[PDB]
Write a protein that binds this ligand. Structure first.
Ligand SMILES: NS(=O)(=O)c1cc2c(cc1Cl)N[C@H]([C@H]1C[C@H]3C=C[C@@H]1C3)NS2(=O)=O
Ligand SMILES: NS(=O)(=O)c1cc2c(cc1Cl)N[C@H]([C@H]1C[C@H]3C=C[C@@H]1C3)NS2(=O)=O
Ligand SMILES: NS(=O)(=O)c1cc2c(cc1Cl)N[C@H]([C@H]1C[C@H]3C=C[C@@H]1C3)NS2(=O)=O
Ligand SMILES: NS(=O)(=O)c1cc2c(cc1Cl)N[C@H]([C@H]1C[C@H]3C=C[C@@H]1C3)NS2(=O)=O
Ligand SMILES: N[C@@H](CCC(=O)O)C(=O)O
Ligand SMILES: N[C@@H](CCC(=O)O)C(=O)O
Ligand SMILES: N[C@@H](CCC(=O)O)C(=O)O
Ligand SMILES: N[C@@H](CCC(=O)O)C(=O)O
Lengths: 260, 270, 270, 260
């Protein structure tokens, strides 16, 4: 029986290849996530099919609705069997569905135009001249929303009272807004995506400061599913063998079209 | 019913208080792990008593006997309820026990003696003989070893990478043995080897020891891999989910980071 | 019974919120003094409603007619219950009202326009024509004045010091008048006088204005004296002792320092 | 009727003159406090006599006894009519007796041997190599005892668990211990006393950092005394006329036997 998989067309995790207009099957996708899905299928021994959630969202909770959108929505409501995609792990999504062991560690990063006058996020909180935003229905905004730290509370109060809407539809739109703003707009995003933007043309954006926290990416599984343990063991096996690191290097630094 | 806690006397996770001879109960110990256990107890209501295993081993499967020892064995055989200690999540351990999400990131680093500054405007430059792991594998004059019954040794013995395979081959046939029995033993070997020995230990203890007096050691290279410290729980136990949720909540609240800077950098002078 | 609070719209003590047109109640105002009033209400249980006097004067005794105006007159005649505002403790005011312990230290400083840097290795040096008060008294090309119905003017008119007597003599017979009616008016006169005018205002507002955009003003010299901002209370009232104790408790707890840093330096770029 | 006044032999507030073995009356004392007392007596028009509390303490609350020592003890228990001395004003003493308006503003200062590696008190709290202490039965230790700030709580926990007893009998003993310790002992003391030590021989000590708080000195009066208002008005009048500042300069910088 073919197993349906939900994901999001995020680079370098998933790509559309180049001649996507004349490609079909599981060979029409290239990237970290599709290769990981193929490896998981080979290890478990099941046929898998890749699908993309119609809305370009990861998943969140609507106001006064209690409905899951994004990939977790497809997982919970019977529209998917496993989500192999860069889905951050937090407390809220852990209650509804179970996560495997993380396969990529990261944190909150600040990206800005190419010394930096803000450096630490403390100055950025204390300096309102440069704006800052996040991605809607992700995990960074959820982290900032319910943070009891004074600095993070001030940041979140800034985000909610922001004219116009500081949030963006996609991280590509976020970096586009950052580049077009000529350094007046900062982007709070995951470390991996920030570095990927940094190491590609035109190499105009750079990461500033350290990481505000520590997170990870997990392979979400429907609650009470028989496949959670096999895929968790497969993730651990890949981490032990270094296949995760090898694929990270393959899709991360093998090309390297920038001067670093 | 008060549950027991398995922990190892490892700095800065667990220390011994100065006035611990006259003190009993949970007041004997101090450090990162005791605060983590206190926060876990505050999150989910239960009574905890700190225990330290006699063998003082992290856990490994003995060959030709198939018997788990250390924390993993103590947890498997039902004589322990929780292991709030720097226990590394591995594939072999996940098959016997239940692991929550990692609460601390780590990597396999290298410990060597810090060289003296070279005299030859009036600035001092650092000279080192090791810059990565490939040169350590190629070079042979300085011996290198790992911790016995640890996660690093198990990772090295089951790695198909050429350089890691060469390191494992050297370690398994090195006379005298390059393996140590404790972290402090390895650090003492590094300090008293006069730069003739390299210790492969985790990055957290590495940086903690580097930042503390007499700060005569220094770490080289990056992390050989990426792993994390989890909280262990016996397979099919009712404490796994609440502990996992507590770890996630503590990570989100920033208490883990606060403990990290409290016990790692606030008490460092070098 | 809800008591009334007398305050002046002075920055950074009290500011007008951006969306105050559609907002009523205590939400209209923001700044140091509104937070001080909130902390006072939290300490001792009572209901407070912020009021701003129409005349907008601090308080002085009119000559030949003997009427107290401003906040002092408002509290003397019983139409107000408390004055949580930057009101200076003076000898003349203490004879008519009750003053608690000061909650902020201040001094009489000088406001002048900041000169441009001089071109003549590659460093920039600051040149100023005034370094103290004695040279200001000796020099006469640049006019200087104070605030009307303020504490500084009352201090100047009743000082036996020779230099201060000379300053008062110059001020009382200056054409056109060197006295301003508001702090903002004096700052505007300093900014638009092209360095031909000096303003004698308190050091707190002086440094707040200096630290804020467009940061085109700069303070010279030390404080002419030492005073403090108190909380006013009508003579023989039951609110004097609880307010004094609340001020002492807030000072001990460090809330006053936290408010000072929040509203004086955290919002400054120059 | 002669009014008795309690004080403490603290310099430059009160001196013993030089030929004290052959002096008597109110003319056997020189200094800021005796001159202030003479001015207050002249303004009010009453005969005053100066006395020193037998114990060299300002005043505090003993454990499980509720008895006032120091100068406030002499004031409360009918042994004095007014205390003209450098008595800091705080909440605890305000409840028992009333204080006039302050006549000298100051704060908590750190003194050390003659750039400084600690600078701010944050480093000193985070650096236990150099010890720090205060004066027993004063106001600095009371401020540190009941401070809810994390840094000040850490400092107070350090003071209580100090071997040997870090407290000193007198500020002169404190500066002696600081000088003999060769920079390994810091002294938390009032700004005025620290500066007075700074501006005298051998000019070996210097103040480090800013002020941890803001305080003041008041003329304590017995609770329910008819003299509180006249002396409060006299203090305000002296502050208005500049006599307080003039006496401060007279006993503070007129001599100036150091290189500044
Ligand atoms: N170097 S990296 O960010 O691509 C990365 C990060 C991580 C990896 C693997 C890689 Cl390649 N696996 C670990 C997992 C392996 C076992 C130990 C911790 C979890 C369970 N999580 S991690 O520390 O988040
Ligand atoms: N010790 S640390 O500051 O580097 C550190 C390391 C890690 C933290 C939190 C901290 Cl503070 N949380 C993550 C976990 C928390 C939740 C989000 C990812 C996993 C589940 N593991 S981690 O990546 O090992
Ligand atoms: N605005 S400030 O930080 O310089 C400042 C100034 C002063 C403060 C407290 C602060 Cl935070 N408290 C004192 C008062 C408080 C208690 C101790 C001395 C008097 C009674 N007045 S003050 O010397 O005018
Ligand atoms: N310059 S100083 O420290 O000797 C000093 C400090 C102060 C003085 C007078 C002097 Cl000389 N008087 C003021 C008082 C006068 C009136 C205004 C504030 C109080 C009531 N308190 S103060 O601000 O604590
Ligand atoms: N990649 C994150 C969202 C990124 C963001 O919100 O900044 C997630 O899957 O939740
Ligand atoms: N922390 C390691 C042991 C120490 C080491 O391997 O260096 C573990 O949990 O196995
Ligand atoms: N703050 C002063 C008025 C301002 C000034 O005099 O500069 C007072 O209370 O009288
Ligand atoms: N001079 C202070 C005490 C000094 C100190 O404790 O440091 C007082 O009168 O309370």
């Amino acid at each position: 029986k073919t197993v349906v998989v939900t994901t999001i067309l995020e680079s370098p995790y998933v790509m559309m290849k180049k001649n996507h207009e004349m490609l079909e099957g599981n060979e029409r996708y290239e990237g970290y996530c599709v290769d990981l899905a193929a490896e998981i299928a080979k290890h478990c021994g099941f046929k898998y099919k890749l699908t993309i959630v119609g809305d370009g969202k990861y998943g969140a909770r609507d106001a006064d609705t209690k409905i899951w959108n994004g990939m977790v929505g497809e997982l919970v409501y019977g529209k998917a069997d496993i989500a192999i995609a860069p889905l951050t792990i937090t407390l809220v999504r852990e209650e509804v569905i179970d996560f495997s062991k993380p396969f990529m560690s990261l944190g909150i990063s600040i990206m800005i135009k190419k010394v930096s006058p803000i450096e630490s996020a403390e100055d950025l909180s204390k300096q309102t001249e440069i704006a800052y935003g996040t991605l809607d229905s992700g995990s960074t905004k959820e982290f900032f929303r319910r943070s009891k730290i004074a600095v993070f509370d001030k940041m979140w109060t800034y985000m909610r009272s922001a004219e116009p809407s500081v949030f963006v539809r996609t991280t590509a739109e976020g970096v586009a807004r950052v580049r077009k703003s000529k350094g007046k707009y900062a982007y709070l995003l995951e470390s991996t995506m920030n570095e990927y933007i940094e190491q590609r043309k035109p190499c105009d954006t750079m990461k500033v400061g350290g990481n505000l926290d520590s997170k990870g990416y997990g392979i979400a599984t429907p609650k009470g599913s028989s496949l959670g343990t096999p895929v968790n063991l497969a993730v651990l096996k890949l981490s032990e063998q270094g296949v995760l690191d090898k694929l990270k290097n393959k899709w991360w630094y093998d090309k390297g079209e920038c001067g670093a």
